[PDB]
Amino acid sequence: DLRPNPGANKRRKRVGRGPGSGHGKTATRGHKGQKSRSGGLKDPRRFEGGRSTTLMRLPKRGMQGQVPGEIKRPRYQGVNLKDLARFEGEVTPELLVRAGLLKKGYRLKILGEGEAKPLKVVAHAFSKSALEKLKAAGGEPVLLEA
């Protein structure tokens, strides 16, 4: 290939916005006209008025956490038998981490959408539904863990 015009295509635009001249964004600088466009202003997102944000709303999202922090408890990850359809033989956790879902996220639970497939399928649980669909050839390796 040549040397010049490998050149950036279509739209790179590194032409950012400077404000200093008679034409463009002049005098007071491309915005501002007033006081509190000057080297800091309060937020907004949350702030201001000095009204009450809306922190008049209320934290019913109760169960916010006690001192020594979280409780370790075994956490479960969903995956649809739809997603399983892909591959054949026998499916197990970690076999799944080496793909889209589960990854490290611990205790596998197969459930839900799509038609089931003839393969034994190790899991920590199922939805009732997915246990039923998986009657169409396939597993009840459940129980697990020790």
């Binding site: 907004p44 997102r45 949350r46 809306t54 922190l55 008049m56 709303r57 209320l58 934290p59 019913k60 999202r61 916010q64």
Partner: protein, 63 residues
């Protein structure tokens, strides 16, 4: 250098799968004494509008 989540909202407003912002109806934590069964009942959750754009921007890491 890395934004912090604004705990005061995390603590009081869910973010839906659309990305609407959901808050409990205000106004029945002690008011009551006798407001209609309709009043005290009619407090499950709700949307907000334009003010959620703001509330979202603060739950920045949790998306």
């Amino acid at each position: 250098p890395k934004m912090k989540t604004h705990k005061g909202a995390k603590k009081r407003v869910k973010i839906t799968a659309s990305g609407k912002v959901v808050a409990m109806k205000t106004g029945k934590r002690h008011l009551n004494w006798q407001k209609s069964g309709k009043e005290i009942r009619q407090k499950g959750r709700k949307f907000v509008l334009a003010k959620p754009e703001a509330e979202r921007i603060k739950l920045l890491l949790p998306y």
